[PDB]
Ligand binder design. Structure first.
Ligand SMILES: Cc1cc2nc3c(=O)[nH]c(=O)nc-3n(C[C@H](O)[C@H](O)[C@H](O)COP(=O)(O)O)c2cc1C
Ligand code: SF4
Lengths: 425, 56
């Protein structure tokens, strides 16, 4: 019932030595000829039966999401979009899954090629990653020259070629409409999701946006057994998600741990700073930056799962650990995260461009402590107003963590406010 | 005669008691320039949180 320690049979293995010829020796592209020969009903049906959750910072299940982009009849040719850009600060899945083992992500494009019915595949990498982009292109150069992608792919009629497209230092490549608009040529602003979803219009084509970690699970489900990825973890949340332990820790390391693992044991397996949850003031974030900060009272009992964490009023989506020490300031740290959202908000929705930017200016006062005690109670209502009324989910991501400053905290905020007001006046 | 001492006896004698509360009656307790600058208090609004017009 409980989550297994690390798991000996893991999906991700490339970390020590792999280039191009080493991928065949490790265990990649083994059943590529058999997977391409199999129909779309067998490929998408296996993914639906396994029940693999969304690896990206959304929380939406993949099994239903891939089904919309099946396309029975369409005029415009279908495309495949793989968003490999780095998400929230803390999540370092992009730097590990692309630079070390690039062929694992390339196998997902071929496996998801015949399944979705894609004519051309796009791999979108962030502008900050240039050393990772050089390794990704060289692996694609070795793949195309060998004769496995393009024209005739593993003895099949479907011809799909992967092309790397570099961004330019933008966080607004997160949303499904945002990454589509960035590759389209226009400014990096997300289109309205309710009328035209991903399957309706993306670069003038019915497409599907997927994370690099989510794309890496597709050859693991196809080549190896479907029950192997389904059994490990919880009943609702399935699939081994790479959770990176970062922040105030003695040894920060990204580990490929199984789903529904306890947070007290997760810090112990990667070796934390002061303690797992005793010595240091526990204000560790269950997500990258989007999720609200978890208190010391509810941390050891709570499990790091895709569904179970949301029930404890801290929805982990980005799948990253950000631990905070007793010596480090809690208020000053999250105020920088809001300042991060100030720089990285696109500027469409007025509750975000004039909301989050206004939220940062109020939060800057809270660090110095020149605010009224009534201002804490007000700010909780503004954060509620931002969360519900936005185009993209960055408005959500800048609303959840500031609500975490109101819940479980507030004696920390009042003591900073009362002492600074008495000293100045 | 214009002396107040003798006159006050006459006005008290001729129908009803007088003396106090004069016709002019603007001698003492008449504050000029009102007061030092005051601060006007705010109602059930002004203080933030739960001040929606949906409720009001
Ligand atoms: C603040 C925020 C940032 C995100 N950043 C990324 C990202 O960098 N890359 C990505 O693939 N998905 C990101 N996502 C998830 C998106 O919603 C994505 O378009 C899609 O849902 C991923 O689908 P999948 O989980 O089925 O792969 C982000 C979500 C949020 C709320
Ligand atoms: S929520 Fe903010 S970042 Fe997202 S589309 Fe609206 S204005 Fe742009």
């Amino acid at each position: 019932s409980l989550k297994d320690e690390d798991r000996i049979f893991t999906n991700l293995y490339g970390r020590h030595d792999w280039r191009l010829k080493g991928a065949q020796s490790r265990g990649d592209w083994y059943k590529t000829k058999e997977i391409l020969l199999k129909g779309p009903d067998w490929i998408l049906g296996e993914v639906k039966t396994s029940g693999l959750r969304g690896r990206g910072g959304a929380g939406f299940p993949t099994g239903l999401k891939w089904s919309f982009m099946n396309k029975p009849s369409d005029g415009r040719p279908k495309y495949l979009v793989v968003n490999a850009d780095e998400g929230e600060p803390g999540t370092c899945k992009d730097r590990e899954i692309i630079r070390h083992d690039p062929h694992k992500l390339v196998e997902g494009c071929l496996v998801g090629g015949r399944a979705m019915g894609a004519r051309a595949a796009y791999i979108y990498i962030r502008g900050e990653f240039y050393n990772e982009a050089s390794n990704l292109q060289v692996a694609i150069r070795e793949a195309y020259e060998a004769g496995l992608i393009g024209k005739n792919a593993c003895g099949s009629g479907y011809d799909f070629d992967v092309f790397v497209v570099r961004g330019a230092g933008a966080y607004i490549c997160g949303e499904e409409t945002a990454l589509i608009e960035s590759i389209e040529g226009k400014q990096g602003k997300p289109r309205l999701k309710p009328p035209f979803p991903a399957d309706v219009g993306v670069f003038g084509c019915p497409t599907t946006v997927a994370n690099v970690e989510t794309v890496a699970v597709s050859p693991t489900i196809c080549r190896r057994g479907g029950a192997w990825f389904a059994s490990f973890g919880r009943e609702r949340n399935s699939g081994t998600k790479l959770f990176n332990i970062s922040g105030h820790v003695n040894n920060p390391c990204t580990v490929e741990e199984e789903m529904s693992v306890p947070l007290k044991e997760l810090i112990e397996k990667h070796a934390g700073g002061v303690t797992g949850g005793w010595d240091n003031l526990l204000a560790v974030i269950p997500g990258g930056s989007s999720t609200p900060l978890i208190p010391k009272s509810v941390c050891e009992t709570v499990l790091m799962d895709f569904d179970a964490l949301i029930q404890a009023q801290t929805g982990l989506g980005t799948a990253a650990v950000i631990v905070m020490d007793r010596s480090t300031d809690i208020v000053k740290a999250i105020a920088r995260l809001i300042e991060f959202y100030k720089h990285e908000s696109c500027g469409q929705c007025t509750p975000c461009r004039e909301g989050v930017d206004w939220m940062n200016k109020v939060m800057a006062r809270f660090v110095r402590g020149d605010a009224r005690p009534a201002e804490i109670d007000s700010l909780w209502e503004i954060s509620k107003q931002i969360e519900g009324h936005t185009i993209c989910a960055l408005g959500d991501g800048a609303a959840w963590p500031v609500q975490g400053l109101i819940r479980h905290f507030r004696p920390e905020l009042e003591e900073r406010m009362q002492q600074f007001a008495q000293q100045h006046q | 005669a214009s002396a107040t001492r003798f006159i006050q006896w006459l006005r008290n004698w001729a129908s009803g008691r007088d003396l106090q509360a004069k016709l002019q009656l603007r001698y003492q307790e008449i504050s000029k320039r009102t007061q030092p600058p005051p601060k006007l208090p705010v109602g059930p609004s002004h203080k933030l949180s739960n001040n929606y017009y949906c409720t009001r």
